[PDB]
Structures are given as structure tokens and as C-alpha cells.
Amino acid sequence: KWKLFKKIPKFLHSAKKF
Numbered sequence: 001k002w003k004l005f006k007k008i009p010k011f012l013h014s015a016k017k018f
Helices: 011-015
Strands: none
Touching: none
């Protein structure tokens, strides 16, 4: 149970801006 297991792959969130 690691809150990071669902936070590292946030590369898709970067493009969400542009």
C-alpha cells in the first residue's frame, strides 16, 4: 500500500496544461 504507486506516472498530467 503506497500512495506513490499511483502518483509517479503523472507524466500525462503535465500535458494536461498544454
